[PDB]
């Protein structure tokens, strides 16, 4: 009757099923409170020996009936591994509730019992702490390898309720939903678990922008009152980009966040996108001024390699040709390595033939900048490093395209050697004419 009562609904009319449910629980209590005694004994701090208030041998000032932390832990594990032999489903439910109430969560996730999934699938509709049971349920589905169900419960911590310990927990749930959906689609290529996967990876960057705001209120404004209001609002949901701009990043004037917010949400492309990539480059150039050129190269590489691995999939948001010209105009100004912009674009994963089409057209522009900066050869040194990097790792071009590309590289190297041999024959023009003929004399073997 106490298990019938539970299975139909715990209803207020069934006073007899309620009494049977209570008298089963009263009987189970001698198990729970003995497991509580052994867990309180094994969780206890070991007593620092009180300085003997008379000289002598050490007195063992403990009752010989007492257990140590190791005995209390052994007898707890042995009594738990007696309780785990029961048939009783309502006792299993009482033991599940007790394992949650003592924070023994991975030991709940050690009970291979068919009653555990139905129990979490009750509690995640009925307890006000609904969140903790969806958490235990996705952890249960992952540990039992039902990754498609785990993903569809981690959704139901973004899309349906949470409470958590900070916004950084939402970023575990989203990253682990992404891991569960990538595990699902690698197991069975159902479009919906790969369609929801883009929605999760968009939610991930909005949640990163939400965290960049939330921590920046803590890092800049934390002596004002309504930072507590705003940080706890930024903790309690996953916000859209309208809130994150209009309610948070504009009133706190966070230009650093305004910039990141408008880097994504459906906006007008070339002119505005190009400004945001200048602002992102010139901020990470500004705020790195305390470091050496090697460290500032590495910091700007990490920025543009991170953001490029998002937006290079969507070339409205990644204006490659402008980003290459601006980074090379900065390298040309700052006196950084000629390999730098070539490394950054290779480590994004930009297709090396399309990367050559950019430096090729930037050279053919004959831009007055390289002349103004007294480096009128610079883009030929870039093209040399790019083409030597291709020649001594030919895997950077696809095994069908490579024979189209070794023509285009010889055709272009012949063009640059006609250009160079029209220039005034300085030691740099002589050396680069040598470098391009050394490159030719390798490309002539790559075909």
């Amino acid at each position: 009757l106490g298990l019938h009562f539970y299975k139909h609904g715990e209803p207020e009319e069934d006073i007899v099923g309620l009494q049977a449910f209570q008298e089963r629980l009263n009987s189970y209590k001698c198990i729970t409170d003995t497991l509580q005694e052994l867990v309180n004994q094994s969780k206890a701090a070991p007593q620092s020996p009180s300085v003997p208030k008379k000289p002598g041998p050490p007195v063992l000032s403990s009752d010989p009936n007492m257990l140590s932390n190791e005995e209390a832990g052994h007898h707890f594990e042995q009594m738990l591994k007696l309780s785990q032999r029961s048939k009783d489903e309502l006792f299993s439910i009482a033991l599940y509730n007790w394992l949650i109430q003592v924070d023994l969560a991975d030991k709940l996730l050690q009970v291979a019992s068919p009653f555990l999934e139905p129990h979490l699938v009750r509690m995640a509709k009925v307890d006000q702490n609904r969140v903790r049971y969806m958490d235990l349920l996705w952890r249960y589905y992952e540990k039992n390898r039902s990754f498609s169900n785990a993903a569809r419960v981690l959704s139901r911590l973004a899309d349906m309720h949470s409470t958590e310990i900070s916004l950084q927990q939402r970023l575990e749930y989203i990253a682990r939903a992404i891991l569960s959906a990538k595990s699902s689609t690698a197991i069975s290529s159902i479009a919906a678990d790969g369609e929801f996967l883009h929605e999760l990876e968009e939610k991930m960057e909005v949640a990163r922008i939400q965290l960049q705001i939330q921590e920046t209120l803590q890092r800049q404004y934390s002596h004002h009152s309504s930072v507590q209001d705003a940080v706890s609002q930024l903790d309690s949901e996953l916000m859209d980009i309208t809130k994150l701009y209009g309610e948070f990043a504009d009133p706190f004037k966070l230009a650093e966040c305004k910039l990141a917010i408008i880097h994504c949400a459906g906006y007008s492309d070339p002119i505005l996108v190009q400004t945001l990539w200048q602002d992102i480059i010139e901020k990470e150039l500004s705020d790195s001024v305390t470091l050496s050129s090697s460290d500032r190269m590495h910091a700007l590489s990490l920025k543009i390699v991170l953001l490029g691995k998002i937006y290079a999939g969507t070339p409205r948001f990644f204006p490659l040709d402008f980003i290459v010209q601006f980074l090379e105009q900065q390298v040309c100004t700052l006196n950084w390595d000629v390999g730098f912009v070539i490394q950054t674009m290779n480590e994004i994963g930009v297709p090396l033939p399309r990367l050559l089409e950019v430096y090729d057209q930037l050279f053919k522009s004959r831009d007055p900048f390289w002349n103004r900066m007294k480096k009128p050869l610079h883009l030929l040194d870039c093209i040399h490093v790019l083409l030597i990097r291709y020649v001594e790792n030919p895997s950077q071009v696809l095994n069908c395209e490579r024979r189209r590309f070794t023509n285009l590289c010889l055709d272009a190297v012949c063009g640059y050697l006609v250009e160079l041999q029209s220039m005034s024959s300085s030691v740099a023009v002589q050396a680069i004419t040598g470098n391009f003929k050394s490159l030719q004399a390798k490309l002539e073997r790559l075909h």
């Binding site: 309504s226 705003a230 859209d240 980009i241 209009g246 949400a265």
Partner: peptide
């Protein structure tokens, strides 16, 4: 949501206590 809307015409002041 991944669509931005500017609306400077009505904001809460985030350099004030609440009323």
């Amino acid at each position: 949501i991944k669509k931005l809307v500017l609306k400077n015409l009505n904001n809460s002041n985030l350099f004030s206590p609440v009323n």
